[PDB]
Amino acid sequence: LRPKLSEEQQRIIAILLDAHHKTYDPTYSDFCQFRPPVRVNDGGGSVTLELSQLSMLPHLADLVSYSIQKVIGFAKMIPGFRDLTSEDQIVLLKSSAIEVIMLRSNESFTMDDMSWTCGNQDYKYRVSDVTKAGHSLELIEPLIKFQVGLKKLNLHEEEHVLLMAICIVSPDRPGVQDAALIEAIQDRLSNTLQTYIRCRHPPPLLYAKMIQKLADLRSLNEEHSKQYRCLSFQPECSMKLTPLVLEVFG
Numbered sequence: 236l237r238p239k240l241s242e243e244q245q246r247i248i249a250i251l252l253d254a255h256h257k258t259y260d261p262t263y264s265d266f267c268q269f270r271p272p273v274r275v276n277d278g279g280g281s282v283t284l285e286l287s288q289l290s291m292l293p294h295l296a297d298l299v300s301y302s303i304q305k306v307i308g309f310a311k312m313i314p315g316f317r318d319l320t321s322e323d324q325i326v327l328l329k330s331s332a333i334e335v336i337m338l339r340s341n342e343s344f345t346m347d348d349m350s351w352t353c354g355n356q357d358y359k360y361r362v363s364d365v366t367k368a369g370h371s372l373e374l375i376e377p378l379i380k381f382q383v384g385l386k387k388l389n390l391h392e393e394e395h396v397l398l399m400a401i402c403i404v405s406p407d408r409p410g411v412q413d414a415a416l417i418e419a420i421q422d423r424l425s426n427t428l429q430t431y432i433r434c435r436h437p438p439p440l441l442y443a444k445m446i447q448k449l450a451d452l453r454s455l456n457e458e459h460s461k462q463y464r465c466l467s468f469q470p471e472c473s474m475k476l477t478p479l480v481l482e483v484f485g
């Protein structure tokens with residue numbers, strides 16, 4: 236059966252598309268405002284050298300910090316998100332931050348050369364840039380696999396925005412107080428997505444594949460958190476970060 240999207244479900248999609256258009260700049264025009272990228276000679280991928288220099292850390296921390304601000308803006312526009320307590324909204328934003336960043340980064344990701352192409356050569360990011368910021372192969376390898384897997388689903392913008400919204404409004408995050416209300420908001424979004432796929436996505440199992448991506452995001456989040464913790468042990472690391480990044484990941 237293919238039930239049609241309700242007036243409410245069509246309204247939810249319009250709100251989320253509008254929210255994304257207002258919080259995502261596909262021209263990457265603010266990137267010149269970040270601390271500049273610096274790429275040291277590191278053909279060997281030396282952990283000692285990367286930790287001593289952390290050459291890409293100020294630029295990558297400014298990029299993630301900027302993206303978190305956009306994610307906070309997007310979340311405020313999710314139907315029902317404002318119905319949650321400020322404590323729950325913050326727990327949800329903090330626990331989902333890195334996952335939503337990985338999802339939204341997919342728009343700039345290109346399978347042409349396996350990079351995140353955000354304008355000129357200075358804003359073209361590869362595996363080596365993330366290692367130059369103190370991260371390791373245990374994070375970057377599955378991150379690239381995830382980006383390809385997601386790119387290959389060829390999501391409609393409607394599906395991409397619904398997926399980010401479902402990711403954020405997750406009742407299974409440590410520290411949430413009103414899990415039942417969060418689940419009700421997520422179910423309203425999940426039902427919109429399942430209905431949309433059946434009614435608007437042409438052939439040639441997409442909903443199941445999108446849910447699997449949300450599970451992959453949990454493992455990437457756990458690895459990112461372990462690696463951030465290591466990176467934070469580097470003397471003088473905090474100046475290379477931002478207050479928002481320090482709060483979200485600290």
Ligand SMILES: CCC(CC)(c1ccc(C#CC(O)(C(F)(F)F)C(F)(F)F)c(C)c1)c1ccc(OC[C@@H](O)CCC(=O)O)c(C)c1
Binds near residue numbers: 258295300484
């Ligand atoms: C996910 C892939 C990548 C690859 C370079 C990325 C970057 C930085 C980090 C980090 C880190 C930190 O641990 C911390 F703490 F910051 F998390 C560190 F800094 F400490 F190292 C990681 C793990 C991955 C990336 C590429 C394009 C991006 O935005 C493109 C547009 O999406 C922007 C516009 C928008 O989003 O509106 C974004 C956001 C991120």
